[PDB]
């Protein structure tokens, strides 16, 4: 059969009859306006379909056109800088094609533009007749100056090359490859279709080792995160949520950044689409826009609730596809608590049993099957390239309490928790990440990088954390420790994001400043163990050398290390006096 | 007049700082972990219906 | 000899798919728990138990999920027997996936016997009682909550706590005839790699039967994962007579895979959404333990369960508290003070403590000093509850020693370090020192006949 | 003789209970005493010792016979019973003999199937009613009836019964009342004119 008839609509549900060859979770097109529906039950000849859109005006007898594909995305060129919804419709192209301000409720606009032409080049020793398996890099498309969109094979199929394309310009519907198998000469374009609920196949997962230099001094030193790791942050109104979302896109060592706004708001989603099109990134040449390595999944709460559940799964499938080219993807999920309130609507429509505080039985299993899609992993394919996906998921608990069926379920899967405090944001301590509640289970896996590179770092952090640990009990009621911990919280941990240097520092300065503030500390521990008031009065100039170390501009690169030598030996003098 | 004013304040600050620490550590965490029990017992009847 | 040789039927007559349940039609004499072999229209092979039959219908449930199952083209292919795992002695050193298949590029097992994964209950008349005390080395488990070879006992922990870091420890230094079967249900990639690369260290891989089932694996496979982990261990013991140590990771995460499949069946919710038979289906995978009469072998279980929201009244530590033979509690306040095995001894009792200690087994003062080391712990814990209210100076000379013991108890009797094992004689000779900062006559649980020897030293 | 376990044994006329059940515990015999012919319940959480009072009843009571019913119990706890009983000899007329001469175990562990938990309670009270008819002062340790009530819930869940509060069927108060009221000291049937008793101590696991 090709079409199905409606045979009754009772809300979101449509019990479409005359569908004998319909599988589960296929996408259909209900009605003459072609509303997108999802097959959810299968009673013999009929098939109960829930419809994503408003099912107003659907009559008994409208054609239900089945597609034969599950909830899937289109992966290919034209995906960088685009703005998608949860079900991958381009919101930027849907406003110029229709010239309106509302989503027209029935438009099946293609996700990738079928008019923009791309410069395709072959793999250059990928000859005709050579055997090619799934995951092999097949070509290279210059999508921007930044991203070389390597065309890959889909992981399902396999065979020998029979028709390849010469280097030139092509559309997204032009046939680029034709593969001989035993049965059929199968041909396929530059666009592959992949379901979001199915994990992208890959060779072998690796332990994550290379730390995500996000830019701040407190994050890259004290509570580090590794690329291929998972991370949760709290979701209040103002703590630091605009900073960590955009500083990690601007200054991190990630090749792409995929941001998932999962049912946020109306105007809080509008400010992201007002800010991310005009952010700038300093590459080795001249500055460029951040929208040449960013892809946005924008989604308000007005949109369908099956496009709010699937916004997380769409954003991770775009993130796992760019992982397979060899890039180091990072994905910012903001938020996951608005995703958990979207599962309660989906399971609430099916009248299933609410397990823990309204949320369905599989809340702990859907979150654990999404945070497990992160990790540094050697990709499929014969060129033997490695990639990674980092998932940062904002948690928005009711009232800010960490006892919740989605907050306690998230903090059992994530390893890094950059606890951002409102109280630190009230006192203008920026960035407002707390140091008592925050942690990293990613300290034992990073000392190999902190020994092969950067050797003098791990005695500092394991000591300076005890300085901040001793200071909280001392502030409840040693006098050397209270002064130096005030210096770390005001110079090292505090960081102004608008200063032309202090917006972003590398790690050699970050290991440099903590070296001096600890070398000043143990010397002052000795200098009292032989007078503290004379120390505070006679060393007032070298305390100015410590508290002004943060201003080593990026016109000063080797000099920033050279000034760290000369401010170190000045502390060697006055400790004996 | 201050020596007999000094020691009568330390008899009234100690029997006040206990009543602060009796409310803060006994009365409120008995009410707080009772209020967490009414919430779940509401929930175990809301899924029973 | 005894086998079945009739060819299997292949039905193309599915009728109803709602959630993970595939209702078949025109089935001819379906049994209750047959494995059926689904063949998807895109060539995918899925398997599944039969959940319940009625007349001509047969409601199967698929293991790998139901996404993609058609109504016309799919060909469910029956099998006239119950789920029989392929079990052999050469499943010792291999890493298996969730259902039954190998991971580390190995072959399928040759399996000299096929065993029912549901097992059979052991006759309680011929079920001998565990007396042989095992040595763990951790002073909180070995000395204070001593476990016997054959005893079932969980480890009560939460998220973030190092349960899997100290469970590999007792997997490492327990005491040539000791086998280990491991089941990982709902672990991360790291924990499945932390357990794989820990038995790659000590050379214990020649007696380890790791069953990994990661978080991306299907949720119905977590049901049959601790079933196959036990009937493997019910073949290395009870049929080949060697002492097996079963460790079930995340027995909490087994139960959310039991709650999810029961809400799909729409049946009888108990406490907090968990099903009504959640006591029984945690008992058929816990009561496969203990020793029997006519076998030298043994099987002892140390399951691990993460109690949600630190509540011991949650149904996951609750129903396992009734069916096991004790519990071991891992505390979060002691983990915040960097105490090594962060275990607290007050809600952690071992039921078989009374039999495994004595003059025949271990050092007759051991059974009695653990009655006293609870008393100095329980009284002193109320002292810190009293110290928060009145003040640090209103304590008397009696309840300053109860704080003095309690500060010295956590750091000296516990926190052995991650690679140090100390025997029961080292446990008591470091445990009697903590009672010698006490005076005489306040050790009221100790009789005077035993107190006279060990106090002067 | 063959007797249906769901039917109560006929008897002449019930009598008031006057003699106490000496359990041997200090708090039990002093503050909250129990008589032979009485009904008792031992609730409490896990690890509290609900069975070590039940094993202290089966060892040192002033009862003629003892019938211990394991209903959803542990497999090791019934093996604990039959091991240490044949070395515990007690005296009646200056002669010592083990307590396994007077103890009959109805063992139905948790591994054993759930519909049989209905039968192990009704069997153990039928043997207790039969030994009452000889005139012996029978005692019975039900252990534990909360695992019997979980067998009523699991059976009624398959029959699509409507539940009462917390899952259990609506006839939970009628099954417990038809089992606990079968206890009581009573002049038995027959001509030799003997007076027996049945004392039920039923553990509850909330
Ligand atoms: N009166 C007692 N004498 C000796 N041990 C006791 C006594 N009361 C409780 N215990 C101990 O408390 C624990 C409770 O055992 P158990 O009865 O199995 O718990 P539960 O009541 O949940 O079944 C055992 O370790 C037991 O030895
Ligand atoms: Mg008991």
PDB file of C-alpha atoms in Angstrom, chain C residues 172-372:
ATOM      1  CA  UNK C 172      40.830  -8.423  44.667  1.00  0.00           C
ATOM      2  CA  UNK C 173      41.881  -9.560  48.160  1.00  0.00           C
ATOM      3  CA  UNK C 174      39.282 -12.106  49.276  1.00  0.00           C
ATOM      4  CA  UNK C 175      40.392 -15.299  50.995  1.00  0.00           C
ATOM      5  CA  UNK C 176      43.583 -21.149  44.310  1.00  0.00           C
ATOM      6  CA  UNK C 177      39.954 -22.323  44.339  1.00  0.00           C
ATOM      7  CA  UNK C 178      38.210 -18.946  44.087  1.00  0.00           C
ATOM      8  CA  UNK C 179      36.190 -17.938  41.032  1.00  0.00           C
ATOM      9  CA  UNK C 180      34.409 -14.641  40.351  1.00  0.00           C
ATOM     10  CA  UNK C 181      31.371 -13.978  38.175  1.00  0.00           C
ATOM     11  CA  UNK C 182      30.662 -10.294  37.586  1.00  0.00           C
ATOM     12  CA  UNK C 183      27.461  -8.706  36.267  1.00  0.00           C
ATOM     13  CA  UNK C 184      27.386  -5.041  35.242  1.00  0.00           C
ATOM     14  CA  UNK C 185      23.822  -3.766  34.769  1.00  0.00           C
ATOM     15  CA  UNK C 186      23.440  -0.115  33.813  1.00  0.00           C
ATOM     16  CA  UNK C 187      27.064   0.933  34.319  1.00  0.00           C
ATOM     17  CA  UNK C 188      28.760   3.838  32.567  1.00  0.00           C
ATOM     18  CA  UNK C 189      31.485   3.446  29.970  1.00  0.00           C
ATOM     19  CA  UNK C 190      34.053   4.347  32.640  1.00  0.00           C
ATOM     20  CA  UNK C 191      32.842   1.861  35.274  1.00  0.00           C
ATOM     21  CA  UNK C 192      32.684  -0.925  32.686  1.00  0.00           C
ATOM     22  CA  UNK C 193      36.239   0.032  31.714  1.00  0.00           C
ATOM     23  CA  UNK C 194      37.359   0.477  35.330  1.00  0.00           C
ATOM     24  CA  UNK C 195      36.208  -3.075  36.111  1.00  0.00           C
ATOM     25  CA  UNK C 196      37.611  -4.532  32.884  1.00  0.00           C
ATOM     26  CA  UNK C 197      41.041  -2.994  33.448  1.00  0.00           C
ATOM     27  CA  UNK C 198      41.163  -3.832  37.158  1.00  0.00           C
ATOM     28  CA  UNK C 199      41.054  -7.591  36.593  1.00  0.00           C
ATOM     29  CA  UNK C 200      43.611  -7.041  33.830  1.00  0.00           C
ATOM     30  CA  UNK C 201      46.033  -6.035  36.601  1.00  0.00           C
ATOM     31  CA  UNK C 202      46.129  -8.733  39.273  1.00  0.00           C
ATOM     32  CA  UNK C 203      46.097 -11.741  36.922  1.00  0.00           C
ATOM     33  CA  UNK C 204      42.657 -12.616  38.245  1.00  0.00           C
ATOM     34  CA  UNK C 205      41.285 -12.681  34.671  1.00  0.00           C
ATOM     35  CA  UNK C 206      41.830 -16.465  34.580  1.00  0.00           C
ATOM     36  CA  UNK C 207      38.900 -16.762  37.049  1.00  0.00           C
ATOM     37  CA  UNK C 208      36.623 -13.847  36.038  1.00  0.00           C
ATOM     38  CA  UNK C 209      33.391 -14.143  34.016  1.00  0.00           C
ATOM     39  CA  UNK C 210      32.594 -10.460  33.418  1.00  0.00           C
ATOM     40  CA  UNK C 211      29.047  -9.841  32.126  1.00  0.00           C
ATOM     41  CA  UNK C 212      28.979  -6.257  30.867  1.00  0.00           C
ATOM     42  CA  UNK C 213      25.723  -4.520  29.969  1.00  0.00           C
ATOM     43  CA  UNK C 214      26.276  -0.804  29.416  1.00  0.00           C
ATOM     44  CA  UNK C 215      23.733   2.019  29.620  1.00  0.00           C
ATOM     45  CA  UNK C 216      23.194   2.073  25.839  1.00  0.00           C
ATOM     46  CA  UNK C 217      22.151  -1.586  25.844  1.00  0.00           C
ATOM     47  CA  UNK C 218      18.382  -2.310  25.745  1.00  0.00           C
ATOM     48  CA  UNK C 219      16.467  -2.139  28.991  1.00  0.00           C
ATOM     49  CA  UNK C 220      14.876  -5.591  28.839  1.00  0.00           C
ATOM     50  CA  UNK C 221      18.334  -7.187  28.597  1.00  0.00           C
ATOM     51  CA  UNK C 222      18.999  -5.963  32.141  1.00  0.00           C
ATOM     52  CA  UNK C 223      16.358  -8.436  33.347  1.00  0.00           C
ATOM     53  CA  UNK C 224      18.157 -11.528  32.046  1.00  0.00           C
ATOM     54  CA  UNK C 225      21.631 -10.250  32.889  1.00  0.00           C
ATOM     55  CA  UNK C 226      21.725 -11.247  36.616  1.00  0.00           C
ATOM     56  CA  UNK C 227      19.850 -14.421  35.700  1.00  0.00           C
ATOM     57  CA  UNK C 228      22.649 -15.614  33.411  1.00  0.00           C
ATOM     58  CA  UNK C 229      25.279 -14.397  35.873  1.00  0.00           C
ATOM     59  CA  UNK C 230      23.915 -16.726  38.541  1.00  0.00           C
ATOM     60  CA  UNK C 231      23.226 -19.861  36.491  1.00  0.00           C
ATOM     61  CA  UNK C 232      26.778 -19.544  35.243  1.00  0.00           C
ATOM     62  CA  UNK C 233      27.834 -19.378  38.896  1.00  0.00           C
ATOM     63  CA  UNK C 234      25.396 -22.201  39.665  1.00  0.00           C
ATOM     64  CA  UNK C 235      27.500 -24.268  37.248  1.00  0.00           C
ATOM     65  CA  UNK C 236      30.971 -23.274  38.454  1.00  0.00           C
ATOM     66  CA  UNK C 237      29.616 -24.159  41.913  1.00  0.00           C
ATOM     67  CA  UNK C 238      27.079 -26.969  42.644  1.00  0.00           C
ATOM     68  CA  UNK C 239      28.269 -28.914  39.569  1.00  0.00           C
ATOM     69  CA  UNK C 240      32.051 -28.372  39.498  1.00  0.00           C
ATOM     70  CA  UNK C 241      32.623 -27.524  43.196  1.00  0.00           C
ATOM     71  CA  UNK C 242      34.592 -24.296  43.280  1.00  0.00           C
ATOM     72  CA  UNK C 243      33.950 -21.212  45.383  1.00  0.00           C
ATOM     73  CA  UNK C 244      32.330 -18.474  43.290  1.00  0.00           C
ATOM     74  CA  UNK C 245      31.909 -14.821  44.296  1.00  0.00           C
ATOM     75  CA  UNK C 246      29.015 -13.139  42.470  1.00  0.00           C
ATOM     76  CA  UNK C 247      28.975  -9.337  42.296  1.00  0.00           C
ATOM     77  CA  UNK C 248      25.937  -7.614  40.805  1.00  0.00           C
ATOM     78  CA  UNK C 249      26.627  -4.006  39.893  1.00  0.00           C
ATOM     79  CA  UNK C 250      23.804  -1.504  40.251  1.00  0.00           C
ATOM     80  CA  UNK C 251      21.055  -3.797  41.575  1.00  0.00           C
ATOM     81  CA  UNK C 252      19.232  -0.492  41.811  1.00  0.00           C
ATOM     82  CA  UNK C 253      19.561  -0.147  38.026  1.00  0.00           C
ATOM     83  CA  UNK C 254      18.176  -3.655  37.581  1.00  0.00           C
ATOM     84  CA  UNK C 255      15.004  -2.562  39.345  1.00  0.00           C
ATOM     85  CA  UNK C 256      14.299   0.489  37.186  1.00  0.00           C
ATOM     86  CA  UNK C 257      14.573  -1.990  34.328  1.00  0.00           C
ATOM     87  CA  UNK C 258      11.991  -4.008  36.265  1.00  0.00           C
ATOM     88  CA  UNK C 259       9.713  -1.033  36.938  1.00  0.00           C
ATOM     89  CA  UNK C 260       9.779   0.087  33.293  1.00  0.00           C
ATOM     90  CA  UNK C 261       8.785  -3.296  31.874  1.00  0.00           C
ATOM     91  CA  UNK C 262       5.961  -3.679  34.400  1.00  0.00           C
ATOM     92  CA  UNK C 263       4.443  -0.273  33.656  1.00  0.00           C
ATOM     93  CA  UNK C 264       4.339  -1.412  30.032  1.00  0.00           C
ATOM     94  CA  UNK C 265       2.368  -4.455  31.206  1.00  0.00           C
ATOM     95  CA  UNK C 266       0.016  -2.144  33.207  1.00  0.00           C
ATOM     96  CA  UNK C 267      -0.106  -4.198  36.409  1.00  0.00           C
ATOM     97  CA  UNK C 268      -0.480  -3.605  40.165  1.00  0.00           C
ATOM     98  CA  UNK C 269       1.970  -0.883  41.279  1.00  0.00           C
ATOM     99  CA  UNK C 270       3.405  -1.262  44.759  1.00  0.00           C
ATOM    100  CA  UNK C 271       5.390   1.428  46.564  1.00  0.00           C
ATOM    101  CA  UNK C 272       6.737   4.270  44.379  1.00  0.00           C
ATOM    102  CA  UNK C 273       5.745   2.704  41.048  1.00  0.00           C
ATOM    103  CA  UNK C 274       7.694  -0.517  41.504  1.00  0.00           C
ATOM    104  CA  UNK C 275       5.561  -3.606  40.750  1.00  0.00           C
ATOM    105  CA  UNK C 276       3.772  -5.816  43.230  1.00  0.00           C
ATOM    106  CA  UNK C 277       6.041  -8.811  42.675  1.00  0.00           C
ATOM    107  CA  UNK C 278       9.212  -6.786  43.214  1.00  0.00           C
ATOM    108  CA  UNK C 279       9.940  -8.736  46.394  1.00  0.00           C
ATOM    109  CA  UNK C 280       9.821 -12.046  44.515  1.00  0.00           C
ATOM    110  CA  UNK C 281      11.895 -11.042  41.494  1.00  0.00           C
ATOM    111  CA  UNK C 282      14.553  -9.695  43.811  1.00  0.00           C
ATOM    112  CA  UNK C 283      14.426 -12.993  45.712  1.00  0.00           C
ATOM    113  CA  UNK C 284      14.824 -15.420  42.807  1.00  0.00           C
ATOM    114  CA  UNK C 285      18.118 -13.643  42.023  1.00  0.00           C
ATOM    115  CA  UNK C 286      19.243 -13.308  45.653  1.00  0.00           C
ATOM    116  CA  UNK C 287      18.401 -16.710  47.132  1.00  0.00           C
ATOM    117  CA  UNK C 288      20.777 -18.480  44.692  1.00  0.00           C
ATOM    118  CA  UNK C 289      23.499 -18.551  47.335  1.00  0.00           C
ATOM    119  CA  UNK C 290      24.782 -20.634  50.224  1.00  0.00           C
ATOM    120  CA  UNK C 291      26.315 -24.100  50.385  1.00  0.00           C
ATOM    121  CA  UNK C 292      24.652 -27.484  49.947  1.00  0.00           C
ATOM    122  CA  UNK C 293      25.418 -30.834  51.578  1.00  0.00           C
ATOM    123  CA  UNK C 294      26.920 -33.065  48.907  1.00  0.00           C
ATOM    124  CA  UNK C 295      29.093 -30.431  47.230  1.00  0.00           C
ATOM    125  CA  UNK C 296      32.351 -28.789  48.244  1.00  0.00           C
ATOM    126  CA  UNK C 297      31.464 -25.683  46.245  1.00  0.00           C
ATOM    127  CA  UNK C 298      29.909 -22.438  47.389  1.00  0.00           C
ATOM    128  CA  UNK C 299      28.442 -19.233  45.989  1.00  0.00           C
ATOM    129  CA  UNK C 300      28.436 -15.908  47.845  1.00  0.00           C
ATOM    130  CA  UNK C 301      26.773 -12.726  46.624  1.00  0.00           C
ATOM    131  CA  UNK C 302      27.877  -9.141  47.119  1.00  0.00           C
ATOM    132  CA  UNK C 303      25.317  -7.092  45.153  1.00  0.00           C
ATOM    133  CA  UNK C 304      25.645  -3.317  44.871  1.00  0.00           C
ATOM    134  CA  UNK C 305      22.619  -1.035  44.889  1.00  0.00           C
ATOM    135  CA  UNK C 306      22.484   2.757  44.780  1.00  0.00           C
ATOM    136  CA  UNK C 307      19.671   3.839  47.086  1.00  0.00           C
ATOM    137  CA  UNK C 308      17.995   6.935  45.590  1.00  0.00           C
ATOM    138  CA  UNK C 309      18.156  10.208  47.557  1.00  0.00           C
ATOM    139  CA  UNK C 310      20.122   8.528  50.417  1.00  0.00           C
ATOM    140  CA  UNK C 311      16.879   7.053  51.809  1.00  0.00           C
ATOM    141  CA  UNK C 312      17.017   3.587  53.375  1.00  0.00           C
ATOM    142  CA  UNK C 313      13.208   3.615  53.345  1.00  0.00           C
ATOM    143  CA  UNK C 314      13.224   3.707  49.515  1.00  0.00           C
ATOM    144  CA  UNK C 315      11.943   0.315  48.245  1.00  0.00           C
ATOM    145  CA  UNK C 316      15.299  -0.637  46.687  1.00  0.00           C
ATOM    146  CA  UNK C 317      17.308  -0.863  49.956  1.00  0.00           C
ATOM    147  CA  UNK C 318      14.105  -1.853  51.753  1.00  0.00           C
ATOM    148  CA  UNK C 319      13.127  -5.065  49.989  1.00  0.00           C
ATOM    149  CA  UNK C 320      16.730  -6.236  49.711  1.00  0.00           C
ATOM    150  CA  UNK C 321      17.091  -5.556  53.424  1.00  0.00           C
ATOM    151  CA  UNK C 322      14.441  -8.190  54.106  1.00  0.00           C
ATOM    152  CA  UNK C 323      15.691 -10.937  51.781  1.00  0.00           C
ATOM    153  CA  UNK C 324      19.488 -10.747  52.123  1.00  0.00           C
ATOM    154  CA  UNK C 325      21.420 -11.788  55.227  1.00  0.00           C
ATOM    155  CA  UNK C 326      22.608  -8.334  56.264  1.00  0.00           C
ATOM    156  CA  UNK C 327      23.755  -5.120  54.635  1.00  0.00           C
ATOM    157  CA  UNK C 328      26.846  -2.930  54.383  1.00  0.00           C
ATOM    158  CA  UNK C 329      26.196   0.811  54.498  1.00  0.00           C
ATOM    159  CA  UNK C 330      28.519   3.294  52.794  1.00  0.00           C
ATOM    160  CA  UNK C 331      28.164   6.755  54.314  1.00  0.00           C
ATOM    161  CA  UNK C 332      28.358  10.051  52.447  1.00  0.00           C
ATOM    162  CA  UNK C 333      29.477  12.210  55.394  1.00  0.00           C
ATOM    163  CA  UNK C 334      32.534   9.992  55.819  1.00  0.00           C
ATOM    164  CA  UNK C 335      33.275  10.203  52.096  1.00  0.00           C
ATOM    165  CA  UNK C 336      33.324  13.994  52.431  1.00  0.00           C
ATOM    166  CA  UNK C 337      36.115  13.638  55.015  1.00  0.00           C
ATOM    167  CA  UNK C 338      38.240  11.523  52.770  1.00  0.00           C
ATOM    168  CA  UNK C 339      37.872   8.434  54.912  1.00  0.00           C
ATOM    169  CA  UNK C 340      38.794   5.536  52.614  1.00  0.00           C
ATOM    170  CA  UNK C 341      36.152   2.848  52.695  1.00  0.00           C
ATOM    171  CA  UNK C 342      33.620   5.372  53.620  1.00  0.00           C
ATOM    172  CA  UNK C 343      31.562   3.019  55.683  1.00  0.00           C
ATOM    173  CA  UNK C 344      29.636   3.695  58.779  1.00  0.00           C
ATOM    174  CA  UNK C 345      28.973   0.742  61.043  1.00  0.00           C
ATOM    175  CA  UNK C 346      25.695   1.673  62.687  1.00  0.00           C
ATOM    176  CA  UNK C 347      23.074   0.587  60.048  1.00  0.00           C
ATOM    177  CA  UNK C 348      25.434  -2.054  58.608  1.00  0.00           C
ATOM    178  CA  UNK C 349      24.855  -5.434  60.265  1.00  0.00           C
ATOM    179  CA  UNK C 350      25.920  -8.907  59.178  1.00  0.00           C
ATOM    180  CA  UNK C 351      23.443 -11.616  60.203  1.00  0.00           C
ATOM    181  CA  UNK C 352      26.018 -14.417  60.080  1.00  0.00           C
ATOM    182  CA  UNK C 353      28.327 -12.694  62.560  1.00  0.00           C
ATOM    183  CA  UNK C 354      27.171 -14.970  65.378  1.00  0.00           C
ATOM    184  CA  UNK C 355      28.275 -18.209  63.711  1.00  0.00           C
ATOM    185  CA  UNK C 356      31.507 -17.232  61.945  1.00  0.00           C
ATOM    186  CA  UNK C 357      33.211 -16.168  65.208  1.00  0.00           C
ATOM    187  CA  UNK C 358      34.332 -18.333  68.135  1.00  0.00           C
ATOM    188  CA  UNK C 359      37.232 -20.235  69.649  1.00  0.00           C
ATOM    189  CA  UNK C 360      37.055 -22.718  66.788  1.00  0.00           C
ATOM    190  CA  UNK C 361      36.978 -20.055  64.068  1.00  0.00           C
ATOM    191  CA  UNK C 362      38.470 -16.695  65.166  1.00  0.00           C
ATOM    192  CA  UNK C 363      39.648 -15.455  68.551  1.00  0.00           C
ATOM    193  CA  UNK C 364      36.738 -15.596  71.087  1.00  0.00           C
ATOM    194  CA  UNK C 365      36.999 -11.916  72.120  1.00  0.00           C
ATOM    195  CA  UNK C 366      36.037 -10.912  68.551  1.00  0.00           C
ATOM    196  CA  UNK C 367      32.336 -11.799  68.835  1.00  0.00           C
ATOM    197  CA  UNK C 368      31.955  -9.835  72.065  1.00  0.00           C
ATOM    198  CA  UNK C 369      34.055  -6.740  71.283  1.00  0.00           C
ATOM    199  CA  UNK C 370      31.784  -5.988  68.321  1.00  0.00           C
ATOM    200  CA  UNK C 371      28.869  -5.729  70.733  1.00  0.00           C
ATOM    201  CA  UNK C 372      30.902  -3.151  72.685  1.00  0.00           C
TER     202      UNK C 372
END
